[PDB]
Amino acid sequence: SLKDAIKDPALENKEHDIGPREQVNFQLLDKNNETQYYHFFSIKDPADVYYTKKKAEVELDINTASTWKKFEVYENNQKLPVRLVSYSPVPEDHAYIRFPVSDGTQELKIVSSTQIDDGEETNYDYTKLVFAKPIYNDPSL
Amino acid sequence: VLSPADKTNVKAAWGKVGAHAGEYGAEALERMFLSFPTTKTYFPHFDLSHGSAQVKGHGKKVADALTNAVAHVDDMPNALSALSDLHAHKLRVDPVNFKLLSHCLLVTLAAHLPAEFTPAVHASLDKFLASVSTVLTSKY
Amino acid sequence: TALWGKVNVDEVGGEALGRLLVVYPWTQRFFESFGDLSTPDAVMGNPKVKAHGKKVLGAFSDGLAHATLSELHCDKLHVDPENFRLLGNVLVCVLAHHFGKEFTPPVQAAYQKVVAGVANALA
Numbered sequence: 076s077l078k079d080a081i082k083d084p085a086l087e088n089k090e091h092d093i094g095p096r097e098q099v100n101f102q103l104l105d106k107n108n109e110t111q112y113y114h115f116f117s118i119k120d121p122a123d124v125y126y127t128k129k130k131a132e133v134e135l136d137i138n139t140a141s142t143w144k145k146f147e148v149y150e151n152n153q154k155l156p157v158r159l160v161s162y163s164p165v166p167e168d169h170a171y172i173r174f175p176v177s178d179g180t181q182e183l184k185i186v187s188s189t190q191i192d193d194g195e196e197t198n199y200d201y202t203k204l205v206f207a208k209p210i211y212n213d214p215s216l
Numbered sequence: 217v218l219s220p221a222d223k224t225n226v227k228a229a230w231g232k233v234g235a236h237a238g239e240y241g242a243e244a245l246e247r248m249f250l251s252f253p254t255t256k257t258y259f260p261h262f263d264l265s266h267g268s269a270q271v272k273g274h275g276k277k278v279a280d281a282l283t284n285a286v287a288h289v290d291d292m293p294n295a296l297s298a299l300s301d302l303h304a305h306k307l308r309v310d311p312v313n314f315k316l317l318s319h320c321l322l323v324t325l326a327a328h329l330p331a332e333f334t335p336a337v338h339a340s341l342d343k344f345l346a347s348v349s350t351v352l353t354s355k356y
Numbered sequence: 357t358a359l360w361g362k363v364n365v366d367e368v369g370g371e372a373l374g375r376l377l378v379v380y381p382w383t384q385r386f387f388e389s390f391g392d393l394s395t396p397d398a399v400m401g402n403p404k405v406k407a408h409g410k411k412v413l414g415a416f417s418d419g420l421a422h423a424t425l426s427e428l429h430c431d432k433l434h435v436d437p438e439n440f441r442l443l444g445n446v447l448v449c450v451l452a453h454h455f456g457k458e459f460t461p462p463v464q465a466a467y468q469k470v471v472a473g474v475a476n477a478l479a
């Protein structure tokens with residue numbers, strides 16, 4: 076729950092820029108390989124992918140975090156561990172999540188959903204995130 | 217002030233328009249000219265005939281401007297910096313004309329998307345379009 | 357004028373007034389007597405908004421066929437002349453919303469004036 080996850084006062088304007096990182100572009104597509112527009116407007120192209128010693132972590136910049144509810148990210152039909160690293164306040168409202176990706180992975184699905192306050196819940200059952208280039212970690216940097 | 221609820225509705229509604237942005241934007245202009253002949257003053261050297269090539273082409277440019285605004289709704293004045301200078305400093309367009317186009321856009325979206333055009337989304341779009349009008353009409 | 361011949365009398369009226377309250381919240385202070393207008397779902401489902409909508413829709417219907425309402429809104433109720441144009445445009449959107457593709461751009465041009473001439477009649 077992104078609405079609930081951005082509550083943590085500790086994550087309010089926390090640092091998440093210190094790291095050997097790379098700019099990697101991507102496309103957000105639906106079940107018919109058409110530009111999934113809501114996500115296209117919300118998520119940032121390109122995604123900053125940070126390098127570690129084990130696995131490279133991709134950071135996603137999602138806007139309107141107050142409306143974003145569910146946001147599960149799967150690699151090869153397996154749920155990756157998503158975590159909030161930082162969050163911007165009411166007017167900006169950008170939430171920043173990170174998750175590890177295996178070497179060579181270029182595509183990963185996003186099962187997500189939005190909800191304005193306690194209103195109707197809009198479900199997005201399938202959203203494919205295709206990178207322009209396969210993600211490869213670099214422990215040397 | 218655009219709330220997170222307003223920001224969400226605008227993204228969703230404009231996302232449901234999708235690939236028909238230029239087609240809707242071209243329609244919106246065509247409605248403004250016929251309904252409000254006073255808006256034709258700013259387009260003297262333009263073919264404003266029925267089903268024109270320039271009007272159809274200009275609708276895409278306006279639709280792409282809205283796409284850029286919706287994509288960068290968190291920071292609109294910087295996103296529409298160059299486009300603000302044109303409508304504010306150079307062309308000096310009257311704010312009243314933007315409200316006519318804003319109305320014509322809402323009528324276009326209402327006609328094509330009946331299921332998505334809910335009273336809440338109506339409020340968000342009119343509020344969003346009023347904000348983009350303020351950015352373009354204001355001098356920085 | 358077949359345009360108006362296919363209109364719904366018992367529901368389109370409340371649609372226009374209902375959106376005016378939701379889209380322009382400040383118009384709700386003129387309708388304090390109607391009670392609950394907090395949520396859009398509550399405002400649209402309010403029976404007084406629907407009931408009053410049938411009157412304002414009938415007011416347009418009488419206007420389309422052809423004065424006294426002018427003295428009521430300006431003197432008694434004190435409604436700003438700009439507020440007539442807002443409901444002026446909300447109704448146009450509602451007509452476009454119901455009819456859809458049939459609400460032709462040349463048809464709107466005609467309605468914008470029926471609406472504009474209405475705003476002026478009250479002023």
Ligand code: HEM
Binds near residue numbers: 258309314349
């Ligand atoms: C929804 C609000 C509007 C948007 C998003 C918008 C967007 C644009 C864009 C993207 C251009 C192209 C600029 C370029 O590349 O040269 C343009 C040009 C122009 N716009 Fe707008 N516009 C809006 C409203 C208006 C209004 C209300 C008027 C006046 C009635 C107007 C008059 C013009 C004129 C005269 C040009 C240049 C035409 C020429 O090439 O001579 N625009 N607009």
Ligand code: HEM
Binds near residue numbers: 383387425429443
């Ligand atoms: C499209 C233009 C409008 C028309 C044709 C219209 C018509 C009417 C009519 C027929 C009545 C009832 C008259 C009676 O039976 O005594 C009425 C009442 C009223 N109108 Fe309007 N109206 C318009 C716009 C507005 C606007 C813009 C406002 C302010 C937002 C407004 C506020 C009111 C109020 C407060 C009442 C009194 C209702 C009550 O008794 O509680 N009207 N209107």
